[PDB]
């Protein structure tokens, strides 16, 4: 996996198919869920990190409207 491979061919070795990216998201989901949520005596931070990643995704598309309230002019 990445963090270990150092070949620019790795990017083409992957399966860039609908079922490929689907299983890629499903794996990342179960990897997140199993590490932060699917644990007894778990914590709330397993959720807050999703909200912060959600806020950041929200502030992203909302930039095209928030760049007209700029205080400075440069």
């Amino acid at each position: 996996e990445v963090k270990l491979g150092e070949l620019p061919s790795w990017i083409l070795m992957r399966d860039f198919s609908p079922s490929g990216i689907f299983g890629a998201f499903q794996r990342g989901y179960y990897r997140y869920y199993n590490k932060y949520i699917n644990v007894k005596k778990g914590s709330i931070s397993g959720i807050t990190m999703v909200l912060a990643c959600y806020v950041l995704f929200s502030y992203s598309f909302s930039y095209k409207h928030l760049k007209h309230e700029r205080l400075r002019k440069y």
Partner: protein, 77 residues
């Protein structure tokens, strides 16, 4: 409280004039890795790591900017 300065006195210090040859030493190492192009051995884990410290020192430059302008929220003019 005070433990910040306890650590700051280790890593947050202007570098002594005696360790600048070690700084250019690692500076010549990294330019050597660029001359040969051997940076391809560098697996992405540390590759991101150096990229992160690269963004850090970049941030120190921008921190130097905002204090050079006597303003925080952009240029006051």
């Amino acid at each position: 409280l005070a433990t910040f300065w306890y650590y700051a006195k280790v890593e947050l210090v202007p570098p002594t004039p005696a360790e600048i040859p070690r700084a250019i030493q690692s500076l010549k190492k990294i330019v050597n890795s660029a001359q040969t192009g051997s940076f391809k051995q560098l697996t992405v884990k540390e590759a991101v790591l150096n990229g992160l410290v690269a963004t850090e020192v970049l941030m120190w430059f921008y921190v130097g900017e905002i204090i050079g302008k006597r303003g925080i929220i952009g240029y006051d003019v």
